[PDB]
Write a protein that binds this ligand. Structure first.
Ligand SMILES: CC(C)CN(C[C@@H](O)[C@H](Cc1ccccc1)NC(=O)O[C@H]1[C@H]2CO[C@H]3OC[C@@H]1[C@H]3C2)S(=O)(=O)c1ccc2nc(NC3CC3)sc2c1
Lengths: 99, 99
């Protein structure tokens, strides 16, 4: 699809058997999801944004279906206010900016 | 242009007579620039991001030239770690997401 930006660019995702809504976020290097139950091993990590830093759990090789496109990569889980799909996964689904 | 996302989508902007680089950020509702000298009146504002909140100065009807495209709108100025072009200006230059 082509998505204009008059509203937030939210898409439906399926991850870890669960359905969520997430923001397609070109300003985000990595993918950060609100606290959720994910299986397997993870590594602690701190990431920074507009208001400071948050502690997240880093999960690697996680499968996500983003608006019907499959991708596998690192997902960060923690106290973000919004689920964010970052460039690490946007590149896999072929997402581009155009103007 | 079309911009792929293997690197950060940075563009050159001109605002208030100054040249800056800023991130084209679909996850940002509004435009937030690092501390800089702007001329007009302003209003105190507080905005929230991944790690908490920051205090910014809100300037309205500010002219920005973003990758050579002109837009006028609200710019927030404060302790953001990176200059962000948000959807309030992305819509004005015709920016879309495509996949
Ligand atoms: C700041 C930006 C450069 C980074 N961010 C992505 C933005 O898209 C963010 C998404 C968001 C939306 C809503 C709430 C929280 C966050 N946008 C935002 O903060 O917008 C704010 C302000 C703007 O206008 C309104 O719109 C929303 C509000 C509001 C006021 S991130 O999330 O911090 C972020 C994401 C991924 C990431 N990966 C890293 N890896 C490490 C480096 C190797 S670091 C890292 C940081």
């Amino acid at each position: 699809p082509q998505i204009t930006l008059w509203q937030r660019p939210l898409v439906t995702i399926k991850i870890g058997g669960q359905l969520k809504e997430a923001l397609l976020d070109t300003g985000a290097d990595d993918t950060v999801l609100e606290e959720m139950s994910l299986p397997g091993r993870w590594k602690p990590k701190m990431i920074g944004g507009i208001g400071g830093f948050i502690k997240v759990r880093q999960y690697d090789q996680i499968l996500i279906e983003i608006c019907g496109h499959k991708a596998i990569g690192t997902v960060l889980v923690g106290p973000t206010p919004v689920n964010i799909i970052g460039r690490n996964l946007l590149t896999q689904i072929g997402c581009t900016l155009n103007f």
